Amino acid sequence: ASVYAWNRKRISNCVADYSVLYNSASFSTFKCYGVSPTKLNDLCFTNVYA
Amino acid sequence: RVYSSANNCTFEYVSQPFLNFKNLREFVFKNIDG
Numbered sequence: 001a002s003v004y005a006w007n008r009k010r011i012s013n014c015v016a017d018y019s020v021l022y023n024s025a026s027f028s029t030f031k032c033y034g035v036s037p038t039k040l041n042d043l044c045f046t047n048v049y050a
Numbered sequence: 051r052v053y054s055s056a057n058n059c060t061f062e063y064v065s066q067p068f069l070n071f072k073n074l075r076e077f078v079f080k081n082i083d084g
């Protein structure tokens with residue numbers, strides 16, 4: 001989507017594997033604010049907004 | 051014909067079907083801790 005009309009997808013009722021994203025070399029920026037990437041694969045959240 | 055609109059969904063779950071009078075179906079529904 002365009003930045004003015006950015007798409008929001010609500011991710012729920014599944015298991016989120018964050019190590020797949022973190023270990024990819026295809027991303028230039030993977031900056032996490034407020035949480036660390038190492039403990040993302042352990043913690044649990046109500047919903048994920050993409 | 052049971053509804054006219056569906057705006058904001060938070061949860062969807064599709065499962066296997068649960069189902070003289072021949073059948074007796076007992077159900078208990080509880081709302082505990084969400």
Ligand SMILES: *[C@@H]1O[C@H](CO)[C@@H](O)[C@H](O)[C@H]1NC(C)=O
Nearest residue numbers: 008010055056057058059060
């Ligand atoms: C719920 O739906 C209305 C319109 O259908 C929308 O304006 C509102 O932002 C929605 N709220 C949430 C939390 O999705």
